[PDB]
Symmetry: D2
Subunit: 279 residues, 4 copies
């Protein structure tokens, strides 16, 4: 009979290439390991959910202000009511008798470019202007002549002398605890220009978290500049919204099971049927 | 220096257990093989989409009426307008700028028990009643005493002397072409009982496809009795609706990209906020 | 708005920015003297004080200072010290106004003669800038055109005919340099008198100047923080500058000017021409000295902007107490687009914030207002009267406009019952199509509601142009039928697909309406342009006027609402909602055509002509700017050459000599129809010093430009002029009752219009219909002033230092959990965060990330594996141990029970770790639960089950799936927040399914981001790992 | 007491905007209508799954050659074995005990960039070469200088005197039945060039379905040239692969429930752990 593969590999007669690479977690040992740090030492130095998010997503032990800023961003992105396009889809799928995972996902896949995309779009827009060095007035003028609105600028109701309180909570944390916020100071000079046009055009919570996550990356001492640019490129700020808004989507799933809401069918009077005549 | 795994596997020194089994498709050769039948002979024998559905899902060369009945089921389940719970979620995800796969899926995941579940529920309910030997009057009286509505019985608009045409199209094909329909005759005798209560309580397209697919499985000669009963349990009529309704959900995606509809936010006056006082 | 700058501010702008090949002399040799300065600072900052003689002048915008004895010529520094002691800080009178002398300027003496003094003046007119010159300073005139330059060769031929031969080359290079300084820094006036040019160079001795203050967005870096002083006689107040700070940061207008801060009559009037009419009526009724402020708010300000404007007024009128009480006039005409509901909701919020001192000062509030959503505005303005005890008298459209002035001042009683109640002549026709520039959907729907009620065949708007979105179609209404109007990114696409369009309605901003109007005059189909924006600079408007004269394009505006032709066409928001179109009967023509400066008083002119006359034929609001695109005679000549008009109504203003062209057009026989006119701004001759009203052109530069002199001059011209605005409708009617008596006007039979259905939002807001809400929610509220998580606001979430587990208790359980319950939840999300890539869900996320999919698709592809076999033992161990514990069976009889049923205990049994080799995630969490939880009865049950299964195999310990499961039940059952029937529901509906999914999503996103870092290619499973067992030929 | 919304909307007292717009299906009448065709005449005219697939997706009556070509595309893209990245994920999710919808979806969401994205990419690439009119030799050399491989060219085993038989089946249908194939003849002239480099560089089934669906769109007479260009842009060939491969993914789900396969855990020696040291 032929030799077992596990016996041949253990005593080194053969070698087979590993088809997968991983870096975030080691679990074939005596202890679970998050990016080199064991699960017991994760809890002894009291790094939180934002602390293990720096281990799993960046393989870096972030400073305690960078951990606590990440947690602070997950509570402001946690929910924004049932009217948004993702929390709508979770409610429709929860009311159709589906499980938690199907209902979460059905609204979680609405996150993308138009819903939940302004978080990553404001980071990429402001970092492109700050690195390719132009003054904030030349950036506002550049966006206007190519017909692009600035992402992360503009709130529907909360304008000025009436500030968005999620923005003032997070901006107060960034000013005291972060050592240097160059892109935040750039983006706060951009809204000084756009609030001279309309009072509404302030930094969103989408545009605040976007430009302060970049300042958390390239000004905390853990990341090199090409590493901190890589995470904005591959979408680490997409995952901040997705992990944040998943908490309110699961809370939206569990809410429709409380209330025992039946199956939803959209009314025919809210739909405009413009079908072809016979084609 | 260690030996290759591929060299040791090809000329027979080592053995390694295969961790997967498949039986629907063989592609590691000169021709694509669908369940033992090559892709050239699939097209020479003029079996269609319902003919390859019998190969990929059941591994059987079904008769030409069974292949064509499957194709008729996929066209009546193809779409039922945008007001249903899945076509709603596809439209919301298409209007949120997502791709085809994300938009299809977000409404495809609503299919389950309340939306799209009456295909498999009316099959299992009527099969359980027919195999238990109870007459159609004793089945109607049984479900009344358990507080259960008969799945696949009932329509809200088209009742009697006013038939559902999708039901009458498919019942006509089943009457001429199927060699024996014992469960359809059972389900058409339950309909003669429930239509003496309300005119509305007729066989759905959900409930005629369910009982004629069971009659297609166990009375076409390809399947044994325990083998046809396995497909109803593992969810072959779930896949008939899901493959059928994917045809209209992609058309609902391509419609909202054609019409260039923007992002949907649900109106606040249609939502009833019943939040706690300060908890 | 031309605002006069000081002599110091103009000289420092000249010395920094002039470009002269001759050297300007005494550059920056100015020293500012205030009565609160230190002379040691001046002698250190500027060292030229001792070295030469000095002259001193008050920098208070005083003209003719040398003839009032306010210029001390050829004074040494010690003579300057003695000069200002009887002058600095006390009173003087210049004409009528009288004020303090608190700003003086030191500049060196210049030795010159009367052959050395010159005079250069550059001022802006409509047709260009006149450059003046005179040789005996102490006159040549040259018009430089709108897009024309001033060359030095042109100065020598015209301006310099009497200048001496050796001084021509030094003036013509200064005047050329002075003129480009005027154009680049946006001046509207620049006088240098005298200008001294000796052999040493050019000495600028005095400087009077005005700049176009609406050009601050252009000249922000050249002007700097430029300060516009108030005129001599009035002081500068920090509440005035607060409101001027709000005006410059939106398209809405917010003006405030304190005339007498101890005055008892305060006005908060909407509109810059409506507030002039209210100030005319107050000053007519003997309330000149008691009128406390001029101010207006217009251009549809928001609720927050109107709150900030109101709380400034209410804080200003509640400083000191008046014995007779105080009067607050919250007036205004019928608004066109200013939302009266949101406007008055900002005012009543300021009254509720100031109801304390408003009772002390005996403030009686009189309200008259019409407009969009005004019934909601007048409702909430009457509720705040009774709940705060302030006597608030609320009126509306049925009341005349300035009736609340007579009721407040005590001239007429308050009725108790009507509270709570080559230009072309034909610009517009029933076939007129228009293109709207911008997302003004309520404006476009208002035109479309106008057209259906006017029985038009097709809508007015053909296309919409918005450069910040792609080409699409937007759904509108044709009555009760929905239509689609195309939206275009480019103007050229709209003009090409729609050649039937001859009107552009330009809703671009003040910094976009110049380029959007230059771009649309490249298209020869557009014969009429309406510019809505207020705040375009006067130099940029005159280039629009210049090209409109060349292209033969009528321009209505800027700073206008547009105009309305009943039966044919309306521009944008003119006439307001359809409530006012039907009330003023603007769906069919009448015989009166009106032209008017202001657009909110046109909606009052719609109302006055409707109730006294068979209606309006065509009304045009030409805008409040200094240089409108079309004047009165651009429209009065059209109305004279129109057979449908039988009489004309003009509503002028103060400033400009436009209404004198109407006087000349009558004497030459060109205008023959009866004309009724009234120029508003009669109050401005009763004030001490000059006041700048809300409109950019409402400034009487001469004695003829006053509205008192213009109303007098139209009376000998045969124009029917009332004594005031409150008798304008009496004389519109009286001319009408003559034109019907002589048979000139035959009123047509009244035909009912095609009524539209009511809006749903309008019917829902005031409660005529009910519609059931098809959704319920409990976790989050976002249509408030603040985001709310289950009754708790977002600031109190962060104030009370609850974490991610704290908001998870709010979003999922709607409960304020204790701090150990919030922290145990976070620990469960940290141990379930990841368990390597070998598990089924982390596999699927890696395969989907290696296929090049996004974060959301890759996370989801592995998230959908969570279920029963992967990640299901968390909820399955909780339901199974709770069912055993609630059934009363002991832990031995539960181990025996599931042995007989062929069931392994969920949450018992770990592959490698055992008793005496403990799972560390279990030991971390069990130590938190034992020290912090009050009681753990199911954990003590599940650890007695574990004592039995570890006596079978040492391997069979509690998992982290079965520890979190039995301790989350103890978290729900024993934290005190939950009842048992409610805590059992959460386990039933799957709260521990969400704990695993939210925890493991953190490691699945980490598995997505890891495969993008490593740049792993597409995965394709080996064929030798798959055992193909396909049928033989079936 | 306020009037009903449904009553006031019925007698025309109020108006409310329809927030949705649809064109593909009308369920609210006496018969189900697929883009102007009732469900009865769909079955009278013997238009098949591909016939209703032109109704739901394009709102057009395609000719019977365009309907039957569309069906043959769904038959050849139906499955390609279990080892591809989507059929893997469906098998892992089916072995983890999940339902049909979740298992289909977990492998369906792999489709779009590197798995199954070459179908829409070969259409867009060859159309852009054909429209911006350059000869096939100047297209092969243009992609070489840009460092881009031609999408839809190249098979791992198949080549001349040994063709891909799915390609040969579909090419004979397009040659016999289509009236004009301008882009297929272009892509078969690009194929003559790349086969002179390596014999394996032939037209894929991803490449011939891509260029003959464009030839079906812009040469069947139903479509305007701007209409046919929009369907390629909004992803009509993304939906052809996804609706096709869903037959094999549901067949892969039903196969692992038949075989009763247990939960899959990947081997640890096929994964290469490259975690940081203690970061
Ligand atoms: C002119 C008017 C119609 C439109 O003004 P508006 O809504 O303030 O202006 P817009 O919406 O165009 O936006 C203002 C600026 O915000 C910019 N903006 C908007 N959203 C933005 C975003 N997210 N990011 C960046 N910039 C943004 C716009 O691009 C615009 O640019 P621009 O001013 O440089 O062109 C309105 O201002 C108005 O009512 N004016 C007064 C009308 C009036 O009084 N006329 C006489 C009445 S009788
Ligand atoms: N910087 C200066 N040096 C010398 N004389 C000056 C200076 N400024 C003004 N004067 C004198 O002031 C007189 C004119 O008064 P002026 O200031 O022009 O009155 P106004 O208030 O109308 O400007 C001139 O005769 C001139 O001699
Ligand atoms: O509310 C009003 O009376 C006028 C106004 O708010 C703004 C306006 O037009 O200013 P003006 O008339 O002074 O030129 C309006 O919306 O019409």
């Amino acid at each position: 009979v032929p030799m077992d593969y596990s016996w041949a590999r253990e005593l080194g007669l053969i070698r087979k290439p590993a088809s997968f690479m991983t870096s975030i977690c080691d679990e074939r040992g005596q202890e679970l390991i998050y990016a080199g740090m064991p699960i017991t030492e994760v809890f002894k130095e009291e790094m939180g959910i934002g602390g293990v998010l720096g281990l799993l997503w960046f393989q870096k032990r972030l400073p305690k202000y960078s951990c606590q800023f990440i947690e602070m961003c997950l509570m402001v992105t946690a929910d924004h009511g049932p009217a948004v396009s993702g929390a709508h889809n979770t409610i429709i799928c929860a009311r159709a008798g589906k499980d938690l995972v199907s209902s979460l996902t059905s609204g979680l896949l609405t996150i993308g470019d138009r819903f939940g995309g302004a978080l990553d779009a404001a980071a990429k827009m402001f970092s492109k202007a700050f690195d390719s060095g132009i003054i904030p007035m030349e950036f506002v003028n550049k966006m206007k002549k190519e017909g692009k609105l600035i992402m992360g600028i503009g709130h529907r109701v909360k304008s000025i002398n009436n500030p968005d309180m999620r923005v003032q909570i997070l901006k107060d944390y960034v000013r005291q605890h972060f050592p240097a916020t160059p892109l935040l100071d750039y983006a706060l000079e951009v809204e000084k220009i756009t609030t001279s046009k309309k009072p509404n055009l302030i930094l969103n919570v989408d545009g605040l978290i976007g430009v302060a996550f970049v300042d958390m990356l390239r000004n905390c001492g853990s990341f090199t500049r090409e590493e901190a640019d890589e995470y904005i490129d591959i979408g680490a700020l997409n995952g901040i919204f997705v992990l944040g808004r998943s908490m309110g989507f699961i809370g939206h799933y569990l809410d429709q099971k409380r209330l025992k809401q039946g199956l939803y069918r959209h009314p025919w009077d809210d739909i405009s049927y413009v079908l072809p005549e016979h084609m």
